[PDB]
Amino acid sequence: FACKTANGTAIPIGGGSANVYVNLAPAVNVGQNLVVDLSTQIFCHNDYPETITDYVTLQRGAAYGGVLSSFSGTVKYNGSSYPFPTTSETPRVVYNSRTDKPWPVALYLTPVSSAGGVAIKAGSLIAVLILRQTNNYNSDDFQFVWNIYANNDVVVPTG
Amino acid sequence: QIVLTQSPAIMSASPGEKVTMTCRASSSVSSSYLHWYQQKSGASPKLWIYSSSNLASGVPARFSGSGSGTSYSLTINSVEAEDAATYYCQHYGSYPLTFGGGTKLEIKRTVAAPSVFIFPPSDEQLKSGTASVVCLLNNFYPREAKVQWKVDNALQSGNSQESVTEQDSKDSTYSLSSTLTLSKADYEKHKVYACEVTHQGLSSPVTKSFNRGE
Amino acid sequence: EVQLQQPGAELVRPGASVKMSCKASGYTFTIYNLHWVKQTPRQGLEWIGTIYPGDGDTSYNQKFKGKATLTVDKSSSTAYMQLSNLTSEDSAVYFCAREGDYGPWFAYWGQGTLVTVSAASTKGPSVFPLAPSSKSTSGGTAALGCLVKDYFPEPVTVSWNSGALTSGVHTFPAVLQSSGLYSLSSVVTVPSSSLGTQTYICNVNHKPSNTKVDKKVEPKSC
């Protein structure tokens, strides 16, 4: 069960880590929302779709940096919305295909009434999300952790 | 910043009654980010309730968190002797965090009679120019305890130190020790060493005494 | 399983720096946030700061900012705190903790490093036997104990019969005597019949001074 990033980095069987550099909106005025889409970046595929079927769940979603202070929001997984930082195990998703299928994780971050200025710093850690894969084949548990950085500063208009 | 104020900070629950501990927030807080921890005195805090309603692993099913927005609280239904601890609330998910105050539950039994004991310094301590004498006050309730020493009927004041035990998790009793430090020259000066204590469970104060090697 | 082991005590001279440790076992180290916290008899638990071992991201409270620097090694699975320009108001018990496997809650904690700021050197505990001294009729409870005197740094751990006699043991908290030292006592109530027929030993352990001692509290015979 190998997962890849749109850039080209890959996490082999067993798990590991992979930094993901996502492009956030240049400016997110208060009262509006900021969408960090990861289905366009993180992809996964089943190694042996014929006989096994993997189960993928978002174990943990943690916020870091200017997201933690200024941007408290939600996470959308397979059409279901949950708090962020996450507080519960998301439901499973079936992977039975040799083709690369996305990981439907979408962060929805909204600015709090704080002015913020430079809410998010370019190159800083803005999220950490944990994928868990346990197969219906044997006693299995792998963790795939993705560190989501921000390429551009997400300035919140003051007025 | 969002601050947490624990209202009671001191309680007294009988071994079979209910109790409620509020944790007010300065501003409204998402109900999934307030967690209650229990720390028994002289130990490390343990997770007790997360997301303001759920129960941590191993916790008895008596605790039932509730509340949302600004006045999250707690409820112990059948208060047992083992719930005497300090309960803290934490709001994690904003960044400043908080561990506002703390509520020290006290379990109230009826009455206990102190078991008064005396121990004189041995030869080992006698060699090193010290003759500390220790008076033990075993399981007693409540914490209204008063020790007083007598060397040939003389009420000492100042040269006595107290140490009180942090309740009990089986009978909610308190225990105390009084240490009387006196130099070897001062120790070989009187032959009647006494220790008397005032408590609710004693009709009259009970004095225990000894002699220098009798 | 998952443990966050901290060293017991830490004695540090004033105006200087001390470095603690927090060894994490039982899980992938570079996967969860490690937090630090302090506890005092004064105002409640104060969150020192955070560290994500997988990236090195740290963030401090707002006030232990020029005093806290959280760094991890990622090789031996340890997290480190170093305290800068440490004064006398920074004497407290420090806990390192980790978030839960499925949420931002302070799941697993540590024993706690009890830092005391002072100048006096470490001193080993002198242990004295508090004899039974049967109370005339006897035939019941006859407490016996041992007194730990002249030890400066907390904590000193007392165990009776080498971690066996937990029945009726009492360890009163330390008291600062008028000599720049701490003292305490440990007493156990035992049946009056066991006296003179059962071996009673109190073991006193002092990590900051590296001294373990065993005392044979026995009924004093005339």
Short mmCIF file of N, CA, C and O in Angstrom, two decimals, chain B residues 71-161:
data_model
loop_
_atom_site.label_atom_id
_atom_site.label_comp_id
_atom_site.label_asym_id
_atom_site.label_seq_id
_atom_site.Cartn_x
_atom_site.Cartn_y
_atom_site.Cartn_z
N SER B 71 -20.02 26.98 30.38
CA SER B 71 -20.18 26.52 31.75
C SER B 71 -20.12 25.01 31.82
O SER B 71 -20.97 24.35 32.42
N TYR B 72 -19.09 24.43 31.21
CA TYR B 72 -18.87 23.00 31.29
C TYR B 72 -18.64 22.59 32.74
O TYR B 72 -17.95 23.28 33.49
N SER B 73 -19.21 21.45 33.12
CA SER B 73 -19.20 21.03 34.52
C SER B 73 -18.87 19.54 34.58
O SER B 73 -18.47 18.93 33.59
N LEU B 74 -19.06 18.96 35.77
CA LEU B 74 -18.76 17.56 36.01
C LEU B 74 -19.77 17.05 37.03
O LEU B 74 -20.43 17.82 37.73
N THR B 75 -19.91 15.72 37.09
CA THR B 75 -20.85 15.11 38.02
C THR B 75 -20.33 13.75 38.45
O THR B 75 -20.15 12.86 37.60
N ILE B 76 -20.11 13.58 39.74
CA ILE B 76 -19.84 12.28 40.34
C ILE B 76 -21.10 11.84 41.07
O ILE B 76 -21.58 12.55 41.96
N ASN B 77 -21.63 10.68 40.71
CA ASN B 77 -22.94 10.27 41.20
C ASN B 77 -22.85 9.58 42.56
O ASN B 77 -23.45 10.05 43.53
N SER B 78 -22.11 8.49 42.64
CA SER B 78 -21.88 7.78 43.90
C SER B 78 -20.44 8.07 44.31
O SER B 78 -19.52 7.32 43.97
N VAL B 79 -20.25 9.17 45.04
CA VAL B 79 -18.91 9.61 45.41
C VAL B 79 -18.27 8.56 46.31
O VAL B 79 -18.74 8.30 47.42
N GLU B 80 -17.19 7.95 45.83
CA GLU B 80 -16.45 6.97 46.61
C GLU B 80 -15.25 7.62 47.28
O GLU B 80 -14.92 8.78 47.03
N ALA B 81 -14.59 6.85 48.15
CA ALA B 81 -13.42 7.37 48.85
C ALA B 81 -12.25 7.61 47.91
O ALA B 81 -11.34 8.38 48.23
N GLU B 82 -12.26 6.96 46.74
CA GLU B 82 -11.14 7.05 45.81
C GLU B 82 -11.24 8.23 44.85
O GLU B 82 -10.38 8.36 43.98
N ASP B 83 -12.26 9.08 44.98
CA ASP B 83 -12.39 10.26 44.14
C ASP B 83 -11.87 11.52 44.82
O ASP B 83 -12.15 12.63 44.34
N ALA B 84 -11.12 11.39 45.91
CA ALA B 84 -10.52 12.54 46.58
C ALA B 84 -9.24 12.91 45.85
O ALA B 84 -8.19 12.29 46.05
N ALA B 85 -9.32 13.92 45.00
CA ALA B 85 -8.18 14.36 44.20
C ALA B 85 -8.44 15.78 43.73
O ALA B 85 -9.40 16.43 44.18
N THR B 86 -7.60 16.27 42.83
CA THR B 86 -7.78 17.59 42.23
C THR B 86 -8.11 17.42 40.76
O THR B 86 -7.39 16.72 40.03
N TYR B 87 -9.19 18.05 40.32
CA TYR B 87 -9.69 17.90 38.96
C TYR B 87 -9.50 19.20 38.20
O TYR B 87 -9.97 20.26 38.64
N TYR B 88 -8.81 19.13 37.07
CA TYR B 88 -8.46 20.29 36.26
C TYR B 88 -9.16 20.22 34.92
O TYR B 88 -9.41 19.14 34.38
N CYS B 89 -9.47 21.39 34.37
CA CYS B 89 -10.02 21.51 33.03
C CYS B 89 -9.02 22.20 32.11
O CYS B 89 -8.38 23.18 32.49
N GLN B 90 -8.89 21.67 30.90
CA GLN B 90 -7.97 22.21 29.90
C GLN B 90 -8.70 22.42 28.59
O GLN B 90 -9.44 21.54 28.13
N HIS B 91 -8.47 23.58 27.98
CA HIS B 91 -9.02 23.95 26.68
C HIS B 91 -7.87 23.97 25.68
O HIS B 91 -7.10 24.93 25.60
N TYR B 92 -7.75 22.89 24.91
CA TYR B 92 -6.68 22.73 23.93
C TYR B 92 -7.30 22.85 22.54
O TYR B 92 -8.22 22.10 22.20
N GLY B 93 -6.76 23.76 21.73
CA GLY B 93 -7.26 23.95 20.38
C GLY B 93 -7.33 25.41 19.98
O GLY B 93 -7.79 25.74 18.88
N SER B 94 -6.88 26.30 20.87
CA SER B 94 -6.81 27.72 20.57
C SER B 94 -5.39 28.26 20.51
O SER B 94 -5.18 29.29 19.85
N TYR B 95 -4.43 27.61 21.19
CA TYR B 95 -2.98 27.82 21.29
C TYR B 95 -2.55 28.35 22.66
O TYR B 95 -1.60 27.80 23.24
N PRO B 96 -3.17 29.40 23.21
CA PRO B 96 -2.77 29.82 24.56
C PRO B 96 -2.96 28.74 25.61
O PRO B 96 -2.24 28.74 26.62
N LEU B 97 -3.90 27.82 25.40
CA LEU B 97 -4.22 26.75 26.35
C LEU B 97 -4.66 27.31 27.69
O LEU B 97 -4.69 28.53 27.89
N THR B 98 -5.03 26.43 28.62
CA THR B 98 -5.40 26.82 29.98
C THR B 98 -5.49 25.58 30.85
O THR B 98 -5.84 24.50 30.37
N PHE B 99 -5.17 25.72 32.13
CA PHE B 99 -5.39 24.69 33.14
C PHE B 99 -6.02 25.30 34.37
O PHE B 99 -5.60 25.05 35.50
N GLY B 100 -7.04 26.13 34.15
CA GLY B 100 -7.59 27.02 35.17
C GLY B 100 -7.89 26.43 36.53
O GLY B 100 -8.77 25.58 36.67
N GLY B 101 -7.15 26.89 37.53
CA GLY B 101 -7.43 26.56 38.92
C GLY B 101 -7.40 25.07 39.18
O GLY B 101 -6.64 24.32 38.56
N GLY B 102 -8.25 24.64 40.10
CA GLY B 102 -8.38 23.24 40.45
C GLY B 102 -9.32 23.04 41.61
O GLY B 102 -9.38 23.88 42.51
N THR B 103 -10.07 21.94 41.60
CA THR B 103 -11.03 21.64 42.66
C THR B 103 -10.55 20.41 43.42
O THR B 103 -10.40 19.34 42.83
N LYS B 104 -10.32 20.57 44.71
CA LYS B 104 -9.83 19.50 45.57
C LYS B 104 -11.01 18.90 46.32
O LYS B 104 -11.48 19.46 47.31
N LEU B 105 -11.50 17.77 45.83
CA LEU B 105 -12.59 17.08 46.51
C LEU B 105 -12.11 16.48 47.82
O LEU B 105 -11.01 15.94 47.91
N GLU B 106 -12.94 16.59 48.85
CA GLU B 106 -12.67 16.01 50.16
C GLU B 106 -13.83 15.11 50.54
O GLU B 106 -14.98 15.56 50.55
N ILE B 107 -13.53 13.86 50.86
CA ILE B 107 -14.55 12.89 51.23
C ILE B 107 -14.71 12.91 52.74
O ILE B 107 -13.72 12.83 53.48
N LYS B 108 -15.95 13.01 53.21
CA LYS B 108 -16.24 13.26 54.61
C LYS B 108 -16.85 12.01 55.24
O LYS B 108 -17.98 11.64 54.92
N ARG B 109 -16.08 11.36 56.11
CA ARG B 109 -16.61 10.28 56.93
C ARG B 109 -17.07 10.89 58.26
O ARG B 109 -17.04 12.11 58.45
N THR B 110 -17.49 10.05 59.21
CA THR B 110 -18.17 10.60 60.38
C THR B 110 -17.18 11.11 61.43
O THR B 110 -17.04 12.32 61.62
N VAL B 111 -16.43 10.20 62.05
CA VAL B 111 -15.56 10.51 63.19
C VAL B 111 -14.54 9.39 63.30
O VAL B 111 -14.87 8.21 63.11
N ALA B 112 -13.29 9.75 63.59
CA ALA B 112 -12.25 8.77 63.84
C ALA B 112 -11.48 9.16 65.09
O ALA B 112 -11.28 10.34 65.38
N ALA B 113 -11.05 8.14 65.83
CA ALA B 113 -10.29 8.34 67.05
C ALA B 113 -8.81 8.14 66.75
O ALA B 113 -8.41 7.03 66.35
N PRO B 114 -7.97 9.16 66.91
CA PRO B 114 -6.55 9.00 66.61
C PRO B 114 -5.92 7.90 67.46
O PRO B 114 -6.23 7.75 68.64
N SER B 115 -5.03 7.13 66.84
CA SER B 115 -4.27 6.09 67.52
C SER B 115 -2.90 6.69 67.84
O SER B 115 -2.03 6.78 66.98
N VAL B 116 -2.73 7.10 69.10
CA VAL B 116 -1.56 7.88 69.47
C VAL B 116 -0.41 6.95 69.82
O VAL B 116 -0.57 6.00 70.59
N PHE B 117 0.76 7.23 69.24
CA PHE B 117 1.94 6.39 69.43
C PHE B 117 3.13 7.30 69.69
O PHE B 117 3.14 8.45 69.27
N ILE B 118 4.13 6.77 70.39
CA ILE B 118 5.33 7.54 70.70
C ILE B 118 6.56 6.71 70.34
O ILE B 118 6.57 5.48 70.47
N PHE B 119 7.60 7.39 69.84
CA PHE B 119 8.85 6.74 69.50
C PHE B 119 10.00 7.65 69.95
O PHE B 119 10.05 8.83 69.54
N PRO B 120 10.91 7.14 70.77
CA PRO B 120 12.04 7.95 71.21
C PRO B 120 13.22 7.80 70.27
O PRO B 120 13.28 6.83 69.49
N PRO B 121 14.17 8.73 70.30
CA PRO B 121 15.40 8.55 69.51
C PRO B 121 16.17 7.33 69.97
O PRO B 121 16.24 7.03 71.17
N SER B 122 16.77 6.63 69.02
CA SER B 122 17.58 5.46 69.33
C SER B 122 19.02 5.88 69.58
O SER B 122 19.35 7.07 69.62
N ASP B 123 19.90 4.89 69.76
CA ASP B 123 21.30 5.19 70.00
C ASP B 123 21.96 5.81 68.78
O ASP B 123 22.82 6.69 68.90
N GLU B 124 21.56 5.36 67.58
CA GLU B 124 22.14 5.88 66.35
C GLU B 124 21.99 7.39 66.27
O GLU B 124 22.96 8.11 65.97
N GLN B 125 20.79 7.90 66.53
CA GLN B 125 20.59 9.34 66.51
C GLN B 125 21.22 10.01 67.72
O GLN B 125 21.67 11.15 67.63
N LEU B 126 21.30 9.29 68.85
CA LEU B 126 21.94 9.84 70.04
C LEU B 126 23.41 10.15 69.80
O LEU B 126 23.93 11.12 70.36
N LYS B 127 24.09 9.35 68.98
CA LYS B 127 25.49 9.62 68.70
C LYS B 127 25.67 10.97 68.00
O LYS B 127 26.58 11.73 68.34
N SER B 128 24.82 11.27 67.02
CA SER B 128 25.00 12.47 66.21
C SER B 128 24.29 13.69 66.81
O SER B 128 23.55 14.39 66.13
N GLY B 129 24.54 13.94 68.09
CA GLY B 129 24.08 15.13 68.78
C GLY B 129 22.65 15.56 68.54
O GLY B 129 22.35 16.76 68.59
N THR B 130 21.75 14.61 68.29
CA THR B 130 20.35 14.92 68.04
C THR B 130 19.48 13.88 68.73
O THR B 130 19.82 12.69 68.76
N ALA B 131 18.36 14.33 69.29
CA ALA B 131 17.46 13.46 70.04
C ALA B 131 16.01 13.73 69.65
O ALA B 131 15.14 13.92 70.49
N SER B 132 15.74 13.75 68.34
CA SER B 132 14.38 13.96 67.86
C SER B 132 13.46 12.85 68.35
O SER B 132 13.77 11.67 68.24
N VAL B 133 12.31 13.25 68.90
CA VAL B 133 11.29 12.33 69.40
C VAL B 133 10.06 12.50 68.53
O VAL B 133 9.64 13.63 68.26
N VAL B 134 9.47 11.39 68.09
CA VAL B 134 8.39 11.43 67.11
C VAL B 134 7.12 10.87 67.72
O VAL B 134 7.10 9.74 68.24
N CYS B 135 6.05 11.65 67.65
CA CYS B 135 4.72 11.26 68.11
C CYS B 135 3.85 11.03 66.88
O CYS B 135 3.69 11.93 66.05
N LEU B 136 3.30 9.83 66.78
CA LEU B 136 2.48 9.42 65.65
C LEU B 136 1.01 9.57 66.01
O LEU B 136 0.59 9.18 67.10
N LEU B 137 0.24 10.13 65.09
CA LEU B 137 -1.20 10.27 65.21
C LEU B 137 -1.80 9.51 64.03
O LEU B 137 -1.80 10.01 62.90
N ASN B 138 -2.30 8.30 64.29
CA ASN B 138 -2.76 7.44 63.20
C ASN B 138 -4.12 7.92 62.70
O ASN B 138 -4.55 9.03 63.03
N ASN B 139 -4.78 7.09 61.90
CA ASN B 139 -5.99 7.46 61.17
C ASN B 139 -6.96 8.26 62.03
O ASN B 139 -7.42 7.79 63.07
N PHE B 140 -7.25 9.48 61.58
CA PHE B 140 -8.17 10.36 62.30
C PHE B 140 -8.88 11.26 61.30
O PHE B 140 -8.33 11.59 60.25
N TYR B 141 -10.11 11.65 61.64
CA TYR B 141 -10.91 12.57 60.86
C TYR B 141 -11.71 13.42 61.83
O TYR B 141 -12.28 12.88 62.79
N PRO B 142 -11.79 14.74 61.62
CA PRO B 142 -11.22 15.53 60.52
C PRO B 142 -9.81 16.04 60.79
O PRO B 142 -9.11 15.56 61.68
N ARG B 143 -9.36 17.03 60.02
CA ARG B 143 -8.01 17.57 60.11
C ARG B 143 -7.83 18.51 61.29
O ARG B 143 -6.80 19.20 61.37
N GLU B 144 -8.79 18.57 62.22
CA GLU B 144 -8.63 19.37 63.43
C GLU B 144 -7.80 18.51 64.39
O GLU B 144 -8.29 17.62 65.09
N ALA B 145 -6.49 18.75 64.35
CA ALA B 145 -5.53 18.03 65.17
C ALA B 145 -4.58 19.01 65.83
O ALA B 145 -4.13 19.97 65.20
N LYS B 146 -4.29 18.77 67.10
CA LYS B 146 -3.45 19.69 67.87
C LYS B 146 -2.57 18.87 68.80
O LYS B 146 -3.08 18.20 69.70
N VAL B 147 -1.26 18.92 68.58
CA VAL B 147 -0.28 18.21 69.38
C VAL B 147 0.42 19.20 70.31
O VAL B 147 0.54 20.39 69.99
N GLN B 148 0.86 18.71 71.47
CA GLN B 148 1.59 19.52 72.43
C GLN B 148 2.46 18.60 73.28
O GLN B 148 2.00 17.55 73.73
N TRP B 149 3.71 19.00 73.49
CA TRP B 149 4.66 18.18 74.21
C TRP B 149 4.88 18.71 75.62
O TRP B 149 4.59 19.86 75.93
N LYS B 150 5.41 17.84 76.48
CA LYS B 150 5.72 18.19 77.86
C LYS B 150 7.02 17.50 78.26
O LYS B 150 7.11 16.27 78.23
N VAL B 151 8.02 18.29 78.63
CA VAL B 151 9.23 17.77 79.26
C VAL B 151 9.13 18.12 80.74
O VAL B 151 9.34 19.28 81.12
N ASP B 152 8.82 17.13 81.56
CA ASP B 152 8.56 17.34 82.99
C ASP B 152 7.49 18.42 83.19
O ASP B 152 7.63 19.33 83.99
N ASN B 153 6.40 18.29 82.42
CA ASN B 153 5.27 19.22 82.45
C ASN B 153 5.71 20.64 82.10
O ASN B 153 5.63 21.57 82.91
N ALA B 154 6.17 20.80 80.86
CA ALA B 154 6.53 22.11 80.32
C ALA B 154 6.08 22.15 78.86
O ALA B 154 6.55 21.35 78.05
N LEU B 155 5.19 23.08 78.54
CA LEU B 155 4.59 23.15 77.21
C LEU B 155 5.57 23.82 76.25
O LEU B 155 5.79 25.03 76.29
N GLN B 156 6.17 23.02 75.37
CA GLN B 156 7.07 23.54 74.36
C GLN B 156 6.31 24.31 73.30
O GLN B 156 5.14 24.03 73.02
N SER B 157 6.97 25.30 72.70
CA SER B 157 6.39 26.09 71.62
C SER B 157 7.50 26.50 70.66
O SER B 157 8.42 27.23 71.05
N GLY B 158 7.41 26.05 69.42
CA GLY B 158 8.39 26.41 68.41
C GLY B 158 9.27 25.26 67.97
O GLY B 158 9.57 25.12 66.78
N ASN B 159 9.70 24.43 68.91
CA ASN B 159 10.57 23.29 68.61
C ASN B 159 9.75 22.02 68.38
O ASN B 159 9.95 20.98 69.01
N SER B 160 8.83 22.11 67.43
CA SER B 160 7.98 20.99 67.07
C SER B 160 7.50 21.18 65.64
O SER B 160 7.05 22.27 65.27
N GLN B 161 7.59 20.12 64.84
CA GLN B 161 7.22 20.18 63.44
C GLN B 161 6.16 19.13 63.13
O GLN B 161 6.21 18.01 63.65
#
